[PDB]
């Protein structure tokens, strides 16, 4: 409920790689177990994903980076260079995406999502595991696991697209929802996402699937 306490939890979580065991989190926030559990439950799975009895908390957000190459303002999304946010922009010729992570316009977007207290490092951790735009490209010719051809040829992800966006309508979906697969982890690793980050994405995407 309290945005200052919530932002503070997001901050501590992002400093520990977007995930913490409930016990290690309690040691940093200095609250009691059902007192913290009240805050997490009230904030909901759009801010914190709680999984199991050894409990872990995963930070998330509804904030997204605008996907357009050239965006006509006003726009309610963040505008930044993903590569720069991750410290890998080898173009800045001038890059068409902002290198000012906490720009005036982004700062307003963060206030709307109650994340204006974050620094650029915490924002990078949060967005990498919450925003699907940070994920490698998904093979458009992939249609499921029990077919003649898995795809038309490729290097892209052979995973359910809708699952990554939190809207897989199929309850017994035959397109893979397992991002923890060796082949997926190999493509993720080459894109700059390590298995700890993929595990967080997996648990956020699992949570979004169980909440329709
Ligand atoms: Zn935009
Ligand atoms: Zn850039
Ligand atoms: Zn393919
Ligand atoms: Zn699916």
């Amino acid at each position: 409920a309290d945005p200052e306490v919530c932002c503070f939890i997001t901050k501590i979580l992002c400093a520990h790689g977007g995930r913490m065991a409930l016990d290690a989190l309690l040691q940093e926030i200095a609250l009691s177990e059902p007192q913290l559990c009240e805050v997490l439950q009230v904030a909901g799975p759009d801010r914190f994903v709680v999984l199991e009895i050894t409990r872990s908390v995963v930070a998330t957000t509804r904030a997204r980076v605008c996907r357009r190459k050239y965006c006509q303002r006003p726009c309610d999304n963040l505008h930044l260079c993903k590569l720069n946010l991750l410290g890998r922009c080898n173009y800045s010729n001038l890059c068409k995406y902002s290198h000012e992570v906490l720009s005036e316009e982004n700062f307003k977007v963060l206030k709307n999502h109650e994340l204006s207290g974050l620094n650029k490092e915490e924002l990078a951790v949060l967005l990498l595991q919450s925003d699907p735009f940070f994920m490698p490209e998904i093979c458009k010719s992939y249609k499921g696991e029990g077919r003649q051809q898995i795809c038309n040829q490729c290097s892209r992800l052979h995973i359910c697209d809708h699952f990554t966006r939190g809207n897989c309508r199929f309850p017994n979906c035959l397109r893979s929802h397992n991002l923890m697969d060796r082949k997926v982890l190999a493509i993720m690793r080459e894109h700059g996402l390590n298995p700890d980050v993929v595990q967080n994405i997996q648990d956020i995407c699992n949570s979004k699937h169980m909440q329709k």
Side-chain angles (χ1 to χ4, degrees), residues 166-168 207-211:
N167 54 10
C168 179
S207 178
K208 294 194 276 175
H209 196 64
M210 313 305 141
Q211 72 171 310

Side-chain angles (χ1 to χ4, degrees), residues 26 28-41:
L26 284 158
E28 293 290 284
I29 186 87
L31 285 176
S32 91
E33 204 160 286
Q35 204 172 31
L36 175 64
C37 285
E38 228 277 300
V39 184
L40 303 163
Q41 276 184 65

Side-chain angles (χ1 to χ4, degrees), residues 62-92 94-104:
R62 287 175 252 87
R64 297 297 180 259
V65 174
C66 184
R67 303 178 181 241
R68 298 156 178 149
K69 288 175 76 181
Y70 301 105
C71 176
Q72 274 169 238
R73 304 310 201 272
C75 175
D76 294 333
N77 289 326
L78 299 156
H79 301 78
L80 52 85
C81 177
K82 285 150 58 190
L83 295 166
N84 179 66
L85 176 69
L86 302 173
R88 303 152 48 196
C89 192
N90 304 326
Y91 194 94
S92 58
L94 56 146
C95 178
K96 79 172 81 56
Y97 306 109
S98 175
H99 283 218
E100 203 189 345
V101 177
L102 312 173
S103 63
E104 296 91 327

Side-chain angles (χ1 to χ4, degrees), residues 139-151 154-181 184-189 191-206:
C139 182
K140 51 241 88 61
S141 64
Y142 175 73
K143 299 264 169 72
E145 279 315 314
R147 329 271 155 176
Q148 209 190 350
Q149 286 187 102
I150 245 76
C151 80
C154 76
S155 51
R156 298 181 184 87
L157 289 179
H158 296 102
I159 279 294
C160 182
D161 183 277
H162 291 277
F163 175 70
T164 76
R165 303 285 199 100
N167 54 10
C168 179
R169 45 273 182 273
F170 290 76
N172 188 76
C173 187
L174 261 66
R175 299 199 188 190
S176 186
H177 288 192
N178 180 34
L179 317 173
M180 293 328 280
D181 182 282
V184 176
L185 297 169
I187 298 165
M188 292 289 190
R189 197 174 268 279
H191 201 83
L193 302 93
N194 75 55
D196 296 312
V197 174
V198 191
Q199 187 65 65
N200 295 353
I201 300 174
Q202 182 76 76
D203 299 335
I204 290 160
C205 289
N206 284 351

Side-chain angles (χ1 to χ4, degrees), residues 44-52 55-64:
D46 293 333
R47 273 300 287 283
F48 314 104
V49 168
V50 179
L51 63 135
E52 292 87 50
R55 292 146 303 163
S56 257
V57 188
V58 183
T60 195
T61 181
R62 287 175 252 87
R64 297 297 180 259

